[PDB]
């Protein structure tokens, strides 16, 4: 699809067999989701945003379906204000910015 | 143009008679620039993201050209680590997400 930006680009994703809403975020290097359980091992990591740094759990090689498009990659879990799909998965679904 | 997302989508903007590098950020409601001494009236604002909130100065009706495409709107100035072009100006340049 083509998504305009008059409203936040929120979409439905499937992850760990659950549906969630997430924001397609070209300003994010990484995908970060609010607290939830994911299967498998995780490693502690830190990431930074506009307000400073937070601690997250890094899950690798996680399948995520985004508007019906398949990705498998790194998902960070922690105290983000909104679920965000970052460039690591945006690239996998062939997402570009156009103007 | 078409901007792929393998790297941070950094582009050249012109604002207040300065050329600057800025990140096209679909996850940002607002445009937030690194500290700069713009003339004009402003008011204080708090904006939030990963890590918490920062204090910024809100300037209205500021012309901003983004890769040759003219825009005019609200710009926030504060201790962001990177210049961020948010949806308020992305909509004005006809920017879409496409996959």
């Amino acid at each position: 699809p083509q998504i305009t930006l008059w409203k936040r680009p929120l979409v439905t994703i499937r992850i760990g067999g659950q549906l969630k809403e997430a924001l397609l975020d070209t300003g994010a290097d990484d995908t970060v989701l609010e607290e939830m359980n994911l299967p498998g091992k995780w490693k502690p990591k830190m990431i930074g945003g506009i307000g400073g740094f937070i601690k997250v759990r890094q899950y690798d090689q996680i399948p995520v379906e985004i508007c019906g498009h398949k990705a498998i990659g790194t998902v960070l879990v922690g105290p983000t204000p909104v679920n965000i799909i970052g460039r690591n998965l945006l690239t996998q679904i062939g997402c570009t910015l156009n103007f | 143009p078409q901007i792929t997302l393998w790297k941070r989508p950094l582009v050249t903007i012109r604002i207040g008679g300065q050329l600057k590098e800025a990140l096209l950020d679909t996850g940002a409601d607002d445009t937030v620039l690194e500290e700069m001494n713009l003339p004009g009236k402003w008011k204080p604002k708090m904006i939030g993201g990963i890590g918490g909130f920062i204090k910024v100065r809100q300037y209205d009706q500021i012309p901003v050209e983004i890769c040759g495409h003219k825009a005019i709107g609200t710009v926030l100035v504060g201790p962001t680590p990177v210049n961020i072009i948010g949806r308020n100006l992305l909509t004005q340049i006809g920017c879409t997400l496409n996959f």
């Binding site: 975020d25 300003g27 994010a28 290097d29 990484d30 970060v32 990591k45 830190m46 990431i47 930074g48 945003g49 506009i50 960070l76 983000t80 965000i84 970052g86 | 941070r8 990140l23 950020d25 996850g27 940002a28 993201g49 990963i50 962001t80 680590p81 990177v82 961020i84």
Partner: peptide, 4 residues
């Protein structure tokens, strides 16, 4: 990792 930068997440704006």
């Amino acid at each position: 990792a930068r997440v704006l």
